[PDB]
Write an enzyme that holds these catalytic residues in place. Structure first.
Site, PDB file in Angstrom:
ATOM      1  CE  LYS A  15      32.878  38.472  36.427  1.00 30.36           C
ATOM      2  NZ  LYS A  15      33.147  37.088  35.959  1.00 30.36           N
TER       3      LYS A  15
HETATM    4  C1  LIG Z   1      26.873  39.655  36.292  1.00 28.45           C
HETATM    5  C2  LIG Z   1      27.948  39.326  37.342  1.00 28.45           C
HETATM    6  C3  LIG Z   1      28.944  38.410  37.115  1.00 28.45           C
HETATM    7  C4  LIG Z   1      29.122  37.576  35.806  1.00 28.45           C
HETATM    8  C5  LIG Z   1      28.784  36.108  36.200  1.00 28.45           C
HETATM    9  C6  LIG Z   1      27.615  35.419  35.817  1.00 28.45           C
HETATM   10  C7  LIG Z   1      26.502  36.045  34.907  1.00 28.45           C
HETATM   11  C8  LIG Z   1      27.436  34.089  36.268  1.00 28.45           C
HETATM   12  O1  LIG Z   1      26.297  33.360  35.912  1.00 28.45           O
HETATM   13  C9  LIG Z   1      28.426  33.450  37.103  1.00 28.45           C
HETATM   14  C10 LIG Z   1      28.223  32.103  37.547  1.00 28.45           C
HETATM   15  C11 LIG Z   1      29.180  31.473  38.360  1.00 28.45           C
HETATM   16  C12 LIG Z   1      30.333  32.163  38.741  1.00 28.45           C
HETATM   17  C13 LIG Z   1      30.533  33.475  38.312  1.00 28.45           C
HETATM   18  C14 LIG Z   1      29.550  34.119  37.475  1.00 28.45           C
HETATM   19  C15 LIG Z   1      29.744  35.462  37.031  1.00 28.45           C
HETATM   20  O2  LIG Z   1      30.903  36.144  37.416  1.00 28.45           O
HETATM   21  C16 LIG Z   1      27.913  40.070  38.719  1.00 28.45           C
HETATM   22  C17 LIG Z   1      26.508  39.923  39.427  1.00 28.45           C
HETATM   23  C18 LIG Z   1      26.602  40.498  40.885  1.00 28.45           C
HETATM   24  C19 LIG Z   1      25.316  40.494  41.703  1.00 28.45           C
HETATM   25  C20 LIG Z   1      24.157  41.158  40.957  1.00 28.45           C
HETATM   26  C21 LIG Z   1      25.602  41.296  42.986  1.00 28.45           C
HETATM   27  C22 LIG Z   1      24.665  40.937  44.186  1.00 28.45           C
HETATM   28  C23 LIG Z   1      25.229  39.837  45.101  1.00 28.45           C
HETATM   29  C24 LIG Z   1      26.459  40.307  45.932  1.00 28.45           C
HETATM   30  C25 LIG Z   1      27.578  39.267  45.894  1.00 28.45           C
HETATM   31  C26 LIG Z   1      26.043  40.556  47.377  1.00 28.45           C
HETATM   32  C27 LIG Z   1      27.257  40.981  48.256  1.00 28.45           C
HETATM   33  C28 LIG Z   1      26.874  41.846  49.486  1.00 28.45           C
HETATM   34  C29 LIG Z   1      28.100  42.527  50.096  1.00 28.45           C
HETATM   35  C30 LIG Z   1      27.704  43.478  51.201  1.00 28.45           C
HETATM   36  C31 LIG Z   1      29.134  41.486  50.601  1.00 28.45           C
END
Ligand SMILES: C/C(=C\Cc1c(C)c(O)c2ccccc2c1O)CCC[C@H](C)CCC[C@H](C)CCCC(C)C
Ligand SMILES: CCCCCCCCCCCCCCCCCC(=O)O[C@H](COC(=O)CCCCCCCCCCCCCCC)COP(=O)(O)OCC[N+](C)(C)C
Ligand SMILES: CCCCCCCCCCCCCCCCCC(=O)O[C@H](COC(=O)CCCCCCCCCCCCCCC)COP(=O)(O)OCC[N+](C)(C)C
Ligand SMILES: *[C@@H]1O[C@H](CO)[C@@H](O[C@@H]2O[C@H](CO)[C@@H](O)[C@H](O)[C@H]2NC(C)=O)[C@H](O)[C@H]1NC(C)=O
Ligand SMILES: *[C@@H]1O[C@H](CO)[C@@H](O[C@@H]2O[C@H](CO)[C@@H](O)[C@H](O)[C@H]2NC(C)=O)[C@H](O)[C@H]1NC(C)=O
Ligand SMILES: CC(=O)N[C@@H]1[C@@H](O)[C@H](O)[C@@H](CO)O[C@H]1O
Ligand SMILES: *[C@@H]1O[C@H](CO)[C@@H](O)[C@H](O)[C@H]1NC(C)=O
Ligand SMILES: *[C@@H]1O[C@H](CO)[C@@H](O)[C@H](O)[C@H]1NC(C)=O
EC number: 4.1.1.90
Lengths: 698, 53
Positions: free
Chosen positions: A188
């Site tokens: 990514k």
């Molecule tokens: C859809 C996304 C990634 C694709 C994906 C999927 C579907 C997986 O099943 C994975 C399983 C294992 C390893 C990698 C995978 C993967 O790449 C981003 C989704 C992001 C999410 C919605 C964001 C909310 C959580 C974030 C990290 C909070 C961070 C807060 C900050 C202030 C630090």
């Protein structure tokens, strides 16, 4: 005692010699976490077989007598008849159940493994990361001694009841999860992810509602959705290993997997990752959990006493006895761990060898861990054929003799489809043909552009796995920044007008036929030099930058590119027929509203009477406008009723639908097993049983 | 224009068509329901194999 030894769990001196490495990799370890993971994995695969592997839908995918173009990795492989396929899936179900209960563990793992990979290699269109992970996990668990705790095999064999296991069983699984997280994270680190293009429209989901309280949508779609995924991938790779960061890592990973489960329809992958996440904890957590219960629960839960010695571990002897010399299985386990982890690290980046499968992306999708990194939008697909006897030129239905739509993005699948069409078209009065393809596709909202040369006979084209394909068009990365400006042009249109952006090579030409409905269509040039030709009068005009032309409606036209470089232009069109229908419908709506509120005291026209009555009974058939109006009103009411639905009803319908799927799968399996064993009865009985199988539960 | 497989030149030539009634098809995801019944000759073969339905 050393800090390094405490953090990593082994000392440097342990790695000085091969024998010490084998002893380290075969030290005793508690089995409980492995048993819990085995149970959860078996349960999730058991639930997954009747849903996504396609057992419910397998009656309409491998039907006997149907003519379908398959996409297997090896041309030698072919599907068996339907009944043997259902037998194969039955063996899969039995193997999964055996793994879940740990009864005859090695046989169950083999029976789950071989059929699963047989199905996986049979069709390349159903490949995806979470099926490859299931296959790999099934392969790993075949060798691990995961039945030493909370397994029926323990009850049937005293030697394998609450026994030690070598450490490498945990090491391989931890390495697999770490490699998944880290490879996904590094993959990514691409320009299309760090810049906000991929997954640009997922920030509108209501699950991201609280983040909007402090951030705007544009920042919410970049900091949280995109950068958060990368940071979580790398951190969850690293944090879970160390004791200090395990709690925060578990919290973030659980939140991440739950959100992925809700947003997408990936299936059981999120739950499998959730089941694997505790594995980085101490190996003995189920035992201390069982200890922290009342005595009544302890009479039912697994044993809490310390595990007994086993034979599959190298035991350090502190009695003064010489240390146990490692045998063969320990060395084999160590070699298996090292070679398997090295192969897993190497395989995602092995695209420089199998260059035949290379495309705009890299290699076949499934074994690269590049999840949700590229989004594609297809515009048009034209399949032309020239007969080898008469010379006639004709056009085929784009999705003919196929069940998937991934052949529009891979050269090898295109070649297999071409061969299948070559063998099948002689049934339709066509001699040895020459087939040409013309496919338009855009990745991550770029200019729509050809992917294969439309002047090459794919039937006679050259293809080998280990050489670059000579008829795959390159992806123009030079036109990337235009994605800014095009977006502005997307925001400058009315609610009716629509725009399509095209980029073309030199030498090639695009022939198009504007339908009669699409009046008031225009073509504008953005970059390059093109010539627009109307064949009605055979008149060709050369267009320079920033020029616009009004194309005819209902006629053929052509665009030729006549510059040294690729030429980019844009079609802007409006659908006149829909506009006129909408104006007429709005007029009719205004008339009924005047009638209802008391205005328009004069008698209504006869054509309006069915609208007030709402039913065609005892009168002339309605005009098409009235039928369209009533259909739109009924559709709007149906949607409004669907929106106003309480939660419990939706949950109940979901459960009933799942129960229907399970019941249908079981009944079809039983029917086919009876057909295999006792033979095939008459047609009427088969029809009756098939009708009974498809009945809704209610 | 003989059977479902063959289509007219006018139908094939139209680039500007209406895809839905929203594309953006990402990989991974799901087979996403069963359009498989729309295959050529699927009904006739199904009725032969499993009798009337
Ligand atoms: C859809 C996304 C990634 C694709 C994906 C999927 C579907 C997986 O099943 C994975 C399983 C294992 C390893 C990698 C995978 C993967 O790449 C981003 C989704 C992001 C999410 C919605 C964001 C909310 C959580 C974030 C990290 C909070 C961070 C807060 C900050 C202030 C630090
Ligand atoms: C002549 C030949 C010479 C040798 C050549 C080959 C040398 C190979 C060296 C690399 C392989 C070493 C395998 C060691 C196995 C091992 O240690 O297994 C395990 C570790 O598990 C693994 O296999 C780890 C998998 C990778 C996970 C990511 C690790 C991140 C490391 C970051 C940098 C530090 C020991 O765990 P434990 O139960 O003792 O718990 C320790 C950690 N705590 C307690 C904090 C949870
Ligand atoms: C120690 C523990 C460590 C932590 C582990 C945590 C994880 C454990 C997971 C264990 C498995 C739990 C169940 C998983 C269920 C599951 O996956 O749910 C489902 C699939 O599972 C199911 O639906 C299972 C249903 C089984 C059938 C149940 C029938 C029950 C009938 C009850 C009686 C009804 C009587 C009616 C008449 C009176 C996901 O659905 P989907 O992928 O199609 O998603 C649809 C919606 N989208 C696409 C938006 C996501
Ligand atoms: C034909 O379609 C064009 C776009 O191809 C439309 O032109 C718009 O016309 C209004 C007239 O007030 C302008 O304000 C807009 O800026 C025009 N749009 C552009 C330049 O993209 C229009 O819908 C159609 N025009 C006619 C005469 O039928
Ligand atoms: C209008 O101009 C175009 C610009 O190329 C002409 O396209 C050429 O047509 C000739 C035959 O007339 C072909 O041999 C060439 O290969 C075409 N050029 C390219 C680049 O493919 C087109 O023919 C012209 N039309 C008329 C009616 O004069
Ligand atoms: C004319 C009208 O009201 N509706 C049309 C329908 O007749 C046509 O079959 C369909 C094709 O996409 O497009 C819509
Ligand atoms: C042409 O195909 C039709 C439709 O499949 C078939 O009935 C017929 O046998 C073929 N005709 C000739 C003259 O080969
Ligand atoms: C244009 O609008 C009409 C409205 O009836 C619709 O049938 C048609 O599918 C639309 N598209 C084209 C290409 O005509």
């Amino acid at each position: 005692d050393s800090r390094i030894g405490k953090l990593l769990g082994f000392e440097w001196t342990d790695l000085s010699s091969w024998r010490r490495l084998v002893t380290l990799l075969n030290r005793p370890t508690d089995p409980a976490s492995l048993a819990v993971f085995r149970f959860l994995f078996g349960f999730l695969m058991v639930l997954d077989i009747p849903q996504e592997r396609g057992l419910s839908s397998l009656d309409r995918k491998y039907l006997d007598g149907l003519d379908v173009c398959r996409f297997p990795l090896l041309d030698a492989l072919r599907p068996l008849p339907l009944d043997w396929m259902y037998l194969v899936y039955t063996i899969m179900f039995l193997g999964a159940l055996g793994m879940m209960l740990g009864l005859c563990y090695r046989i169950s793992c083999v029976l789950f493994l071989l059929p699963y990979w047989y199905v996986f290699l049979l069709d390349k269109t159903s490949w995806n990361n979470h099926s490859y992970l299931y296959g790999l996990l099934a392969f790993q668990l075949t060798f691990m001694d995961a039945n030493h705790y909370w397994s029926v095999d323990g009850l049937l064999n005293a030697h394998r009841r609450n026994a030690h296991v070598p450490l490498w069983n945990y090491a391989v699984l931890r390495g697999q999860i770490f490699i998944v997280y880290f490879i996904a994270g590094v993959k990514k680190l691409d320009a299309d992810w760090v810049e906000g293009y991929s997954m640009e429209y997922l920030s509108r989901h209501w699950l991201f509602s609280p983040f909007k309280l402090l951030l705007s949508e544009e920042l919410t779609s970049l900091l949280v959705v995109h950068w958060g995924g990368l940071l979580l991938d790398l951190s969850a790779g690293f944090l879970l290993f160390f004791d200090v960061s395990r709690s925060i890592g578990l919290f973030f990973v659980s939140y991440f997997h739950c959100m992925n489960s809700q947003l997408f329809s990936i299936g059981m992958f999120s739950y499998v990752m959730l089941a694997s996440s505790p594995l980085f904890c101490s190996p003995e957590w189920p035992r201390k959990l069982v200890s922290y219960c009342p005595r009544r629960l302890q009479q039912l839960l697994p044993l809490k006493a310390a595990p007994q010695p086993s034979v599959s571990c190298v035991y350090k002897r502190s009695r003064g006895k010489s240390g146990q010399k490692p045998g063969l299985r320990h060395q084999l386990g160590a070699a298996f761990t090292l070679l398997y982890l090295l192969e897993q690290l190497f395989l995602p980046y092995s695209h420089f060898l199998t260059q035949g499968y290379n495309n705009w992306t890299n290699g076949l999708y499934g074994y690269s861990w590049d999840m949700m990194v590229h989004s594609r939008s297809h515009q048009h697909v034209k399949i032309t054929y020239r007969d080898g006897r008469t010379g006639e030129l004709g056009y085929l239905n784009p999705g003919v003799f196929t069940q998937s739509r991934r052949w529009k993005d891979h050269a090898d699948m295109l070649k297999q489809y071409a061969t299948c069409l070559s063998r099948l078209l002689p049934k339709y009065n066509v001699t040895e043909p020459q087939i040409y393809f013309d496919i338009w596709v855009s990745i991550n909202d770029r200019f729509q552009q050809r992917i294969f040369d439309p002047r090459v006979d794919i039937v006679q084209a050259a293809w080998s796995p280990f050489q670059r394909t000579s008829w795959v068009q390159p992806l123009l990365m030079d036109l990337s920044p235009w994605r800014a400006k095009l977006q502005e042009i997307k925001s400058s249109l009315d609610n009716h007008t629509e725009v399509v952006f095209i980029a073309d090579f030199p030498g090639l030409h695009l022939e198009n036929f504007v339908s009669e409905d699409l009046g008031n269509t225009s073509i504008q040039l953005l970059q390059g030099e093109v010539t627009v030709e109307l064949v009605a009068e055979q008149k060709n005009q050369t267009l320079r930058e920033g020029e616009k032309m009004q194309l005819p409606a209902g006629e053929y036209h052509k665009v030729y590119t006549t510059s040294p470089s690729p030429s980019c232009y844009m079609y802007v069109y409006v659908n006149t027929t829909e506009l006129a229908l909408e104006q007429d419908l709005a007029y009719l709506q205004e008339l009924k509203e005047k009638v209802e509120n008391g205005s328009e005291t004069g008698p209504l026209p006869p054509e309006l009477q069915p609208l007030l009555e709402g039913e065609v009974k005892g009168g002339p058939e309605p005009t098409p406008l009235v039928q369209t109006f009533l259909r739109r009103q009924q559709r709007l009411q149906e949607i409004e009723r669907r929106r106003n639905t309480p939660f419990h009803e939706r949950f109940f319908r979901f459960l009933l639908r799942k129960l229907y799927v399970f019941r249908r799968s079981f009944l079809m399996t039983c029917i086919s097993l009876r057909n295999l064993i006792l033979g095939r009865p008459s047609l009427e009985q088969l029809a009756q049983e098939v009708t009974y199988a498809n009945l809704r539960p209610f | 224009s003989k059977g479902a497989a063959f289509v007219s030149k006018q139908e094939g030539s139209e680039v500007v068509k209406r895809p839905r009634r929203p594309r953006r098809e990402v990989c991974e995801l799901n087979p996403d329901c069963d359009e498989l019944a729309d295959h050529i000759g699927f009904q006739e073969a199904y009725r032969r194999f499993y009798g009337p339905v």
